[PDB]
Design a protein around this ligand. Structure first.
Ligand code: FE
Ligand code: FE
Ligand code: FE
Ligand code: FE
Lengths: 139, 139
């Protein structure tokens, strides 16, 4: 049983995506609760969200064997991690977000299109910042 | 323009999932840098992760118009948020994780199968805990 190419690999990727989203959703729901004055609910959402952090990171540790779910590249060492982050970010600013901006604009969603453009620019800033840190890495 | 049914809706869902995973990946990468002693890099992954929170939460806000990406249910109020969280967790513990445990065991990945069963039990506990909060909610 090599994990590479298994159904179990795809499941880990799927479950990693889901738990990642669960954390983000629960933190969003926490902020709603905050404003409403529902402090016990807010606290429960934050606590559950820590749970989903442990789940997501557990999945990701198994995926170390086959590569970063976002890029397929090796990860583990800071060098590799930075390298994979740069590749993923580069894809987001040169392909994904501009593509999404154009589709939005084409469908008449002008505010969302400008949002995707804002984020294309931020991801380019992220890629460049990580490239600078990689250049300076002494390992 | 109706957001529901559009390609822009799909793109928001996809971007939400990607940004959610980027935050998780970058916090994992921070931990690796922590251990190695690369504290400037760790601080950078953590700061970039904050960016990805802002992006993912910005995407979720537009999706309030069409419903929670994990359940299709409306969200916004604590009452709605708990309901959605419950529905998603119920699916994860009754269906998703049990199914993945069994596929793992079939393919010869015993440890991963036990992992998935651990998370089945954890999502059941999350789902029950949220149902309790929901019954206690006063709004
Ligand atoms: Fe979980
Ligand atoms: Fe980024
Ligand atoms: Fe981002
Ligand atoms: Fe959960």
């Amino acid at each position: 049983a090599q994990l590479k190419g298994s159904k179990t690999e795809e499941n880990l990727k799927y479950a990693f995506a889901g738990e990642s989203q669960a954390n983000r959703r629960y933190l969003y729901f926490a902020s709603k609760a905050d404003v409403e004055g529902q402090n016990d609910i807010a606290a429960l959402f934050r606590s559950t969200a820590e749970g989903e952090t442990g789940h997501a990171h557990g999945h990701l540790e198994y995926l170390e064997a086959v590569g970063d779910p976002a890029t397929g590249l090796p990860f583990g060492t800071s060098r590799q991690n930075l390298q994979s982050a740069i590749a993923g970010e580069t894809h987001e600013y040169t392909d994904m977000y501009p593509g999404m901006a154009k589709t939005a604009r084409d469908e008449g969603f002008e505010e969302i299109a400008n949002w995707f453009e804002t984020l294309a620019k931020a991801e380019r800033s992220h890629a460049n910042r990580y490239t600078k840190a990689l250049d300076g890495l002494v390992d």
